[PDB]
Design a protein around this ligand. Structure first.
Ligand SMILES: [Se]
Ligand SMILES: [Se]
Ligand SMILES: [Se]
Ligand SMILES: [Se]
Ligand SMILES: [Se]
Ligand SMILES: [Se]
Ligand SMILES: [Se]
Ligand SMILES: [Se]
Ligand SMILES: [Se]
Ligand SMILES: [Se]
Ligand SMILES: [Se]
Ligand SMILES: [Se]
Ligand SMILES: [Se]
Ligand SMILES: [Se]
Ligand SMILES: [Se]
Ligand SMILES: [Se]
Ligand SMILES: [Se]
Ligand SMILES: [Se]
Ligand SMILES: [Se]
Ligand SMILES: [Se]
Ligand SMILES: [Se]
Ligand SMILES: [Se]
Ligand SMILES: [Se]
Ligand SMILES: [Se]
Lengths: 103, 231, 94, 88, 205, 159
C-alpha cells in the first residue's frame, strides 16, 4: 500500500477502497471497469430483493452502503504452494544440520 | 527356604565341547558326584502329596564293581554307560543301624521357586532298626527308588552346574533313563523366603545364561503338573 | 561345528566377489557410451562408484586370511612355573 | 548364529538393496529439488549403510576368531634337601 | 559310661540356684549356656507306643531325633555336623529346616504338635571327668520343675560317678525325683543317644 | 473449498509429527545416544515428509489454482502480523540458497538458446535413460526323551 495516503487522505471506509487499487498499484482493466464508473463519475460531472441476489455476494456482500453504484455496474459485468516452499526451507535447515552432522 | 530351578539337554557327542565349554565359560570344569535318590510313599495302607525321599554317596569300588571299573579315572565314566546301565542291580532295597541319610520338602510370571526346607541324619537301631523298617516303621512305606551321577562346574554367586545321568532299580531289573544323551542341573537355595529383589536378580543372572545358553540348547523351565511331588 | 560357520563364512565371502566385481562391469560400459558432453555424469558416480566399492575389494582380501588362518592357526598353569623354580633349586644344588 | 545369516543375508539382500536404489539414482518444482539431495543422502546413507554393513561384516569376520613329579619321590626327596639342606 | 540324665516334677526356679554353695567346691569352670525345647507329635491317624515324642537341644549348635516304640534315628539342621561331603554330592540342600517347622506347619493335617514345654539359658560347670550343666522348665501349669546333666570321659568310672551323684544328692535334704539308666539297643553305641532314653523314659513319656 | 484438502493437512500433521520427536531428541543432547537407532529413526521420519511432499504433487493443481488465502477470517487485530509473516510463508534465505541454485544453474543458459538447444536438453536426458537398460541388463548377471515335565511327573513317578 502507501502511507502518504492516510496522512492527508483521512481514509474512512468506502473512500478507503480506492486507496487500495491506487496504493497496491495492482488493478488493471477489470478492476478498471470500476474505473469506467469513476471515470464516468468525473466525465459525467462535466420484491426487487428477489430481483437482486448475487448470493455469492448476497450471502456475503451483505450490508455495504454503496457497492450499489458498482453493483449496478456489477449488474452489468458479464499459493498454498508458497506456504509449502518455506516448509521446503524447513527441510534445508534439517538438510545442512543433517549434513553438518555427517561431519 | 525358597529355591528356583530349570534345565535342558544335548547329544552325547556335542557334550565334548559343552563339558570344556562349561570349563571355558564357567571357569570351572565338571566334577563327579554320585547321587541316588530313593522313594517311599507314606505307608500306602494307612488311610487317615509328597512321597518319602532318601539319598547318599558311596564307595567308588561299590558303584562299579568290575576291575575297580576298568582302572581309575575321573570323567572316564562319561563315555562308558548307556545300555550297560546296571553297575548294581540295586541289591534290592538295601538300607539294624541306618547309615547317614537325608531329605527335605518343597512346594509350589518368569520362573518357579518352591519352598524347600531341609534336614539330615546319622544312624538307627532297635526293634525295627533298619532303614527300610524305620522308614515304613516311621509310617512311610516304599513307593520307588532312583539314582544318578553328575559333573558340576563352579560359578559366581555360589552357582554350580552338574551334568547328570540317571538309573532306576526295581523288582523287574534296573535300567538307566539317561538314554539319548546327557543332562544338566543348576540351582540357588535361598534363605527361606529371601528378598524377592534378589528373586529379581536371581533370574537376570540366569537370563544372561538362559539366552546365552539359548542356542547351544534352549533355556526353558518344565511343567507344573509334573512339578508337584504329588502321586 | 567350526566348519559350518566358516562354511557360511566363505559362503558369504563368495557373495562379495559377485559384489565388488559387478562394480567393475559397472564402470566399463560408462566409457563406451562415453564421449559425450555430459558423459561426465557417470564420472561423478561411476568414479565415486568404483572409487567407493573398490575398497569393498579391500574387504575381500581379509576373508581368505581367515580361512588361511585355519591354515595359519587363575587362570594360569604357573604351578608348572613352580616346576620352573623347582628345576632352578635342583639346579642350584646340582 | 543363524541370525547373522538372517540379518546379514538381509544385509546381503542389503548389498542387493544397496546397489538397487543407489545406481537407481533417478534422472514437481519444490519436491524435485527435494528428491535430488534426497538420494545424495539416502542413496549414500544406505551406501554408508552397506558400508556400515561392510564394516560390521568386515571386522565381525574377525569375531570368528574366538607332570614330572615322580609322585612325592621327586617331591619330598627334593622337599627336604631344599629346606634341610637349607638350614642345617 | 559316658552319659546320664534326670528330671523333677516337684521343684521351683528358686530351688534352682541353691545347690551351688555346697557344689561350689567341685566347680572349676562355668562354660557356655544351653537352651532347649520338647514337644509331642500326636498323629491324627485313626486307631491301629502310639505317642510320638520330639525334643531339641542347643549347646554350640543344634540337631534333632525321634523315638517311638524302640525305633529311632538322628538328624540335624546344621552344615558342620553334616559332612560337607553330603553337600559334595550336592545332595545337601543348604536350605536346612526346623524339623518342628517341618512337621508342625507342613504336616498340620495329621501330626500336629500336641504338647509343648521347655526351659532356657542353661549353663555349664565342670565336674571332673563328668561335666554338669543345669536349667529349669516351665509348663502351662506354671512352674513345672528343674533338670541337669553329666558326661564321663572314662567308661569304667561310671559306677563311682552314678554313686557320687546321689551322695551329693542325699545332702539334698529334699524329696524324691528319679531317673533311668537304660540303653535302647543292647548295642548302645552313642554317649550322645543314651542320655536321651534316661530323659524321655525318666520324664515318664 | 477442499472438502478433501483437510485430509491433506492431517497428512501434513502425520509428517509434522516427524519433526516432533526429532526436535525433542535434539534437546536430548548433549549426552550421546544410539546413532544407528536415532539416525535411522530420523532419516525414516524425514523421508515421509517428501512422500507427503509427493502426495501433494498429485494435488499440485490446487497449490497452483493454489486454493490460496480466501482463508483468513480471524481478525487478529494486529498481532497476527507475526501470523502474517507466518501466513505469508514466502521464501527465506533458502531463497538466498535458491539463487545459489541459480548460480549452480550456472550455464547454460537462456538467454541461451530458444528451443533447439532445449530439444538438445531433452534429447540429452533421454540418452541417460538408455544407458540404464544397458545397466539393469548386466545387473541380473550375478544376481528326544520326554519333555522334562513328564520326567518331573516321573519325579512324581508318572511313566
Ligand atoms: Se461511497
Ligand atoms: Se477510461
Ligand atoms: Se448495494
Ligand atoms: Se442484477
Ligand atoms: Se549437527
Ligand atoms: Se552421511
Ligand atoms: Se571433531
Ligand atoms: Se557357568
Ligand atoms: Se566302565
Ligand atoms: Se517361590
Ligand atoms: Se520311607
Ligand atoms: Se528369564
Ligand atoms: Se519345576
Ligand atoms: Se559394497
Ligand atoms: Se594369519
Ligand atoms: Se607345581
Ligand atoms: Se536416487
Ligand atoms: Se523444495
Ligand atoms: Se529420501
Ligand atoms: Se624351597
Ligand atoms: Se492423519
Ligand atoms: Se522443538
Ligand atoms: Se536434531
Ligand atoms: Se527453489
Amino acid at each position: 500500500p502507501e502511507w502518504i495516503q492516510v496522512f492527508g487522505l483521512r481514509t474512512e471506509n468506502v473512500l478507503d477502497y480506492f486507496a487500495e487499487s491506487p496504493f497496491f498499484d495492482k488493478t488493471s482493466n477489470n478492476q478498471v471497469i470500476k474505473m469506467q464508473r469513476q471515470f464516468s463519475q468525473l466525465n459525467d460531472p462535466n420484491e426487487e430483493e428477489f430481483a437482486y441476489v448475487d448470493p455469492a455476494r448476497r450471502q456475503i456482500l451483505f450490508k455495504y452502503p454503496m457497492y450499489m453504484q458498482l453493483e449496478e455496474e456489477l449488474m452489468k459485468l458479464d499459493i498454498f504452494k508458497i506456504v509449502q516452499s518455506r516448509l521446503m526451507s524447513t527441510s534445508y535447515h534439517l538438510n545442512s544440520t543433517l549434513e553438518s552432522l555427517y561431519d | 527356604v525358597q529355591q528356583l530351578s530349570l534345565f535342558g539337554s544335548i547329544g552325547d557327542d556335542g557334550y565334548d565341547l559343552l563339558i570344556s565349554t562349561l570349563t571355558t565359560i564357567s571357569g570351572n570344569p565338571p566334577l563327579l558326584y554320585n547321587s541316588l535318590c530313593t522313594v517311599w510313599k507314606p505307608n500306602p495302607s494307612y488311610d487317615v502329596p509328597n512321597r518319602i525321599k532318601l539319598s547318599k554317596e558311596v564307595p567308588f569300588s561299590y558303584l562299579i564293581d568290575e576291575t575297580m571299573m576298568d582302572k581309575p579315572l575321573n570323567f572316564r565314566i562319561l563315555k562308558s554307560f548307556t545300555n550297560d546301565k546296571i553297575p548294581l542291580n540295586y541289591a534290592m532295597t538295601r538300607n539294624e543301624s541306618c547309615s547317614p541319610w537325608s531329605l527335605q520338602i518343597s512346594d509350589i510370571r518368569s520362573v518357579s521357586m518352591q519352598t524347600i526346607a531341609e534336614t539330615i541324619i546319622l544312624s538307627s537301631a532297635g526293634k525295627n532298626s533298619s532303614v527300610s523298617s524305620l522308614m515304613n516303621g516311621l509310617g512311610y512305606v516304599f513307593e520307588f527308588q532312583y539314582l544318578t551321577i553328575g559333573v558340576k562346574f563352579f560359578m559366581k554367586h555360589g552357582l554350580i552346574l552338574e551334568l547328570q545321568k540317571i538309573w532306576q532299580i526295581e523288582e523287574a531289573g534296573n535300567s538307566q533313563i539317561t538314554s539319548g544323551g546327557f543332562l544338566l542341573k543348576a540351582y540357588i537355595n535361598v534363605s527361606r523366603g529371601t528378598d524377592i529383589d534378589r528373586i529379581n536378580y536371581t533370574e537376570t543372572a540366569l537370563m544372561n545364561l538362559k539366552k546365552e545358553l539359548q542356542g547351544y540348547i534352549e533355556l526353558s523351565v518344565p511343567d507344573r503338573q509334573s512339578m508337584d511331588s504329588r502321586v | 561345528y567350526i566348519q559350518e560357520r566358516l562354511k557360511s563364512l566363505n559362503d558369504i565371502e563368495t557373495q562379495l566377489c559377485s559384489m565388488l566385481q559387478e562394480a567393475s562391469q559397472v564402470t566399463f560400459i560408462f566409457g563406451e557410451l562415453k564421449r559425450g558432453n555430459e558423459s561426465v555424469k557417470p564420472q561423478f558416480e561411476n568414479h565415486v562408484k568404483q572409487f567407493y566399492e573398490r575398497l569393498d575389494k579391500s574387504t575381500t582380501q581379509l576373508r581368505k586370511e581367515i580361512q588361511l588362518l585355519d591354515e595359519n592357526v587363575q587362570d594360569t598353569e604357573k604351578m608348572e612355573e613352580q616346576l620352573d623354580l623347582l628345576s632352578a633349586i635342583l639346579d642350584p644344588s646340582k | 548364529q543363524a541370525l547373522y545369516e538372517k540379518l546379514e543375508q538381509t544385509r546381503t539382500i542389503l548389498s542387493v538393496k544397496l546397489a538397487e536404489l543407489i545406481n537407481m539414482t533417478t534422472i514437481s518444482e519444490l519436491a524435485v529439488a527435494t528428491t535430488s539431495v534426497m538420494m545424495v543422502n539416502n542413496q549414500t546413507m544406505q551406501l554408508i549403510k552397506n558400508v556400515q554393513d561392510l564394516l560390521i561384516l568386515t571386522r565381525s569376520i574377525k569375531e570368528k576368531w574366538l607332570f614330572d613329579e615322580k609322585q612325592i619321590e621327586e617331591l619330598l626327596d627334593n622337599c627336604i634337601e631344599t629346606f634341610v639342606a637349607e638350614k642345617t | 559310661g559316658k552319659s546320664a540324665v534326670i528330671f523333677v516334677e516337684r521343684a521351683t526356679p528358686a530351688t534352682l540356684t541353691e545347690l551351688k554353695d555346697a557344689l561350689s567346691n567341685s566347680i572349676l569352670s562355668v562354660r557356655d549356656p544351653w537352651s532347649i525345647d520338647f514337644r509331642t507329635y500326636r498323629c491324627s491317624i485313626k486307631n491301629l507306643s502310639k505317642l510320638m515324642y520330639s525334643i531339641t537341644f542347643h549347646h554350640h549348635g543344634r540337631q534333632t531325633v525321634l523315638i517311638k516304640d524302640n525305633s529311632a534315628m538322628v538328624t540335624t539342621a546344621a552344615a558342620a555336623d553334616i559332612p560337607p561331603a553330603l553337600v559334595f554330592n550336592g545332595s545337601s540342600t543348604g536350605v536346612p529346616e526346623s524339623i518342628d517347622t517341618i512337621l508342625s506347619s507342613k504336616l498340620s493335617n495329621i501330626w500336629m504338635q500336641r504338647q509343648l514345654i521347655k526351659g532356657d539359658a542353661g549353663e555349664t560347670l565342670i565336674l571332673d571327668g563328668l561335666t554338669v550343666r543345669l536349667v529349669n522348665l516351665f509348663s502351662s501349669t506354671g512352674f513345672k520343675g528343674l533338670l541337669i546333666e553329666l558326661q564321663a570321659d572314662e567308661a569304667g568310672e561310671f559306677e563311682t560317678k552314678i554313686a557320687g551323684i546321689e551322695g551329693h544328692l542325699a545332702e539334698i535334704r529334699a524329696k524324691e525325683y528319679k531317673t533311668s539308666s537304660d540303653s535302647l539297643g543292647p548295642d548302645t553305641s552313642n554317649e550322645i543317644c543314651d542320655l536321651a532314653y534316661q530323659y524321655v523314659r525318666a520324664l515318664e513319656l | 473449498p477442499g472438502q478433501a484438502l483437510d485430509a491433506v493437512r492431517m497428512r501434513l500433521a502425520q509428517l509434522t509429527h516427524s519433526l516432533r520427536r526429532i526436535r525433542d531428541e535434539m534437546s536430548k543432547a548433549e549426552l550421546p545416544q544410539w546413532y544407528t537407532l536415532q539416525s535411522q529413526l530420523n532419516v525414516t521420519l524425514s523421508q515421509l515428509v517428501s512422500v507427503t511432499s509427493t502426495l501433494q504433487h498429485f494435488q499440485e493443481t490446487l497449490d497452483s489454482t493454489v486454493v490460496y488465502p480466501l482463508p483468513k477470517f480471524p481478525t487478529t487485530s494486529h498481532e497476527s502480523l507475526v501470523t502474517t509473516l507466518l501466513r505469508k510463508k514466502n521464501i527465506p534465505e533458502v531463497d538466498e540458497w535458491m539463487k545459489y541454485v541459480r548460480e549452480t544453474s550456472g550455464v547454460t543458459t537462456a538467454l541461451l538458446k530458444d528451443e533447439e538447444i532445449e530439444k538438445l536438453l531433452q534429447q540429452d536426458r533421454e540418452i541417460t535413460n538408455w544407458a540404464r537398460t544397458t545397466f539393469r541388463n548386466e545387473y541380473g548377471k550375478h544376481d528326544p526323551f520326554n519333555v522334562d515335565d513328564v520326567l518331573k511327573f516321573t519325579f512324581t513317578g508318572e511313566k
